[PDB]
Amino acid sequence: ATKAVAVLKGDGPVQGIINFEQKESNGPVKVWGSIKGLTEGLHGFHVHGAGGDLGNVTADKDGVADVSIEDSVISLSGDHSIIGRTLVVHEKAGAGAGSRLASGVIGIAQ
Numbered sequence: 001a002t003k004a005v006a007v008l009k010g011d012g013p014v015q016g017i018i019n020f021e022q023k024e025s026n027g028p029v030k031v032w033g034s035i036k037g038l039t040e041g042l043h044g045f046h047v048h049g050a051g052g053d054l055g056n057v058t059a060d061k062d063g064v065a066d067v068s069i070e071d072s073v074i075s076l077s078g079d080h081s082i083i084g085r086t087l088v089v090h091e092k093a094g095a096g097a098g099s100r101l102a103s104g105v106i107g108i109a110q
Contacts, residue, residue: 001076003110006087010102013037014091028072035065041093048086082106
């Protein structure tokens with residue numbers, strides 16, 4: 001795939017839309033979009049499984065986290081393609097494990 005989208009759904013007001021684009025089969029993947037309804041501060045952000053860490057997103061005082069990352073680890077093609085895998089964000093601010101997630105399956109757009 002060349003483009004993909006995850007619709008993130010969580011508890012209460014947590015919801016978001018994250019886009020993935022990759023021009024070429026082995027090339028870098030642009031990840032961009034936003035998540036709203038979050039508590040202020042850092043929230044863990046990654047593709048479920050191995051090889052999918054996207055670090056943290058930062059939610060502002062309105063609970064909005066804008067996302068604009070380029071990542072050369074993940075791919076939309078090949079064996080560890082993230083297509084069909086689950087994108088998650090921890091609803092609990094800060095580091096460590098969390099049980100309350102907002103999530104969505106990464107679906108093909110193009």
